Amino acid sequence: AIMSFYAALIDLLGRCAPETHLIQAGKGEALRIRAILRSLVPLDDLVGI
Amino acid sequence: NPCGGERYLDFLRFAVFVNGESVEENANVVVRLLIRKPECFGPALRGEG
Amino acid sequence: EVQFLRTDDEVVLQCSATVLKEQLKLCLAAEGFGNRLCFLEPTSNAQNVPPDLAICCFILEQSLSVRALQEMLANHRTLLYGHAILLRHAHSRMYLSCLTTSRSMTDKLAFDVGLQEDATGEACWWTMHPASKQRSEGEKVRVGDDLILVSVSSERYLHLSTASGELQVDASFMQTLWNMNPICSGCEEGFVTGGHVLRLFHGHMDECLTISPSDSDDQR
Amino acid sequence: LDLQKDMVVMLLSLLEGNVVNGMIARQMVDMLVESSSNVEMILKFFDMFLKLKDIVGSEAFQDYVTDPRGLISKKDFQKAMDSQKQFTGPEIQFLLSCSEADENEMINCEEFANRFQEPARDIGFNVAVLLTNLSEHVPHDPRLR
Amino acid sequence: IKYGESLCFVQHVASGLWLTYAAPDPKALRLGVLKKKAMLHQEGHMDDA
Amino acid sequence: VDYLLRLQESISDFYWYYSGKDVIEEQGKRNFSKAMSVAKQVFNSLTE
């Protein structure tokens, strides 16, 4: 259950991540949201899991 | 309560992701709400401990 | 009479903590040159040990609505709740900002708060929000009000951290109440005010009050 | 403009029954001073769109006007405004933008001058009444002068 | 003193302390309770009226 | 007065949204018109 909860949370955040075309267009809101998501979930934790 | 947490996360996932693309309007709102209530991230992603 | 904060005013950001069940007031301070990180200078014991206030002073350079700030980034006014403010360190002339680094072991989601040389980007802008329902958005900020600062770039609160042994300041998702205590508003031209750096001349004899040069035998 | 007229009517209603150095009058003066720059823009708008009617009526600018149809070119309009000296360069640019020039850069003055005369006049008179009332009931305010 | 309109600060005469609310109760969200214990303090808060 | 302040803040937000754009589209014009009609009614009520 704990694993499933954390997997669902990571999935929801990833789906909340902005689209690549918005990122290329350089929308401030999109860049800020991506920065927040990266702050929440470290990359090393994802690689470890 | 990881089980209920996962159910609510599933609903939020369906709210934010549509037809393989992220809905920015819903995703930004959901991310802001989640960070405004950090307990939604579970005890692991809790800041203090 | 009620006094309202205005741009170009000097302020100190003050928070309160409880240490040994005794209230302790602390001001947000930073050196700027050689150390960009913000710390907390206690000011409750001022009668016994004067605080180092020269580095606690911030000037309100600008105050904009969120939409106006967004337009400006894409390209004396009274402060109102919900606006975004830019705070310039009086000494170093850098800008209070939410840093991308973090030196906090206790909190993984927190960010460091410090000074940055330039006023470009959204990292140096903070939004003020009322601490209680007594105030409402768009209402003028009154001196002595309790407000919450939210980083525009990181959406994190200016937060007082006590998790470690000592009191630190960082940007986190837990909120802290701050007071924007005024220091000066506008100086009548040619008049002396507190907190100024000056020379005390002996009448007009071109003699000033000083101490001995460095490495003097009298220990200065 | 109609909404602005209604707001000004509300302000005059607030001033109904005012006394000299009344608190409501002083607070209204403070509000105007606080919004000074925007009040300046509004007054500039009305003053410019009356002075332009005056200038188009003036014959000196009609000397710069040469086209038999009465429509003037952008450059000729700019030169005429510069010669009259009533408008500064940024203002001249603004009226050029509002000129509503055709594909041939021809400005139809007979309509450009009359476009906002009627709608403006009401708000202009009400603002003049407001300023006169405030001036006569707060006679010693440097900001108001 | 007027009903509704007037704002009153309550002061204990003998000690001079002000009537205010105690510091936020820890784990308030986990409690789910908005009660705030009242107390007498030397300084109080700005919204004590 | 409180409702008027809320409406004024909303209208200021709309203006700031449209400030950069060269022209206001039809839907934005309709929304501006509705907001202005409500503001006009509120001002008339205060005058009354």
Chain F stretch 1-48, residues whose beta carbon is closer than 8 A to a beta carbon of chain C: 5, 9, 12-13, 16-17, 19-20
Beta-carbon separation of F13 and C65 below 8 A: yes
CA trace torsion C99, C105, C107, C110 (10° rounding): 0
Q: Which residues of B touch C108 (CB under 8 A)?
A: 45, 47
Query: 3-state class of C108 per DSSP?
Result: coil
Distance from CA of A22 to the nearest CA of B (A): 10
Beta-carbon separation of C71 and F20 below 8 A: yes
Q: Which residues of C touch F5 (CB under 8 A)?
A: 138
Q: Which of C165, C90, C180, C99 is nearest to C135 (CA)?
A: C180
Q: Which residues of B touch A2 (CB under 8 A)?
A: 2
SS (H, E, C) chain E: CCCCCCCCCCECCCCCCEEEECCCCCCHHHHCCCCCCEEEECCCCCCCC
Asked whether the beta carbons of C15 and C52 are under 8 A apart, the reply is no
| Subunit partners of chain F (3 or more CB pairs within 8 A) | C, D
Beta-carbon separation of E46 and C23 below 8 A: no
Beta-carbon separation of A28 and C111 below 8 A: no
Based on the number of CB atoms within 10 Å of its own CB, is A28 exposed (0-12), middle (13-18) or buried (19 or more)?
middle
Measure CB to CB from residue A12 to each of B9, B21, B35 and give the nearest one. B9
Determination approach: cryo-EM
Q: Which two tokens stand for residue F41?
A: 């009614």
Beta-carbon separation of E47 and C144 below 8 A: no
Q: What is the resolution of this structure in A?
A: 2.5
Partner C contacted by A28 (CB < 8 A): yes
Q: Which two tokens stand for residue D119?
A: 């709608």
Side-chain-side CA neighbours of B29 within 13 Å: the count stands at 9
Find, in chain C, the residue whose alpha carbon is nearest to that of E23.
C18
Question: Which residues of F are documented as binding site for Ca(2+)?
Answer: 48
Find, in chain C, the residue whose alpha carbon is nearest to that of E42.
C23
C64-100 as b/e: b if 16+ CB within 10 A: bbeebbbeeeeeeeebbbbbbbbbbbbbbebbbbbbe
Measure CB to CB from residue F46 to each of D2, D3, D10 and give the nearest one. D10
Separation CA F40–CA F34 (nearest Å): 10
Measure CB to CB from residue E46 to each of C18, C23, C146 and give the nearest one. C146
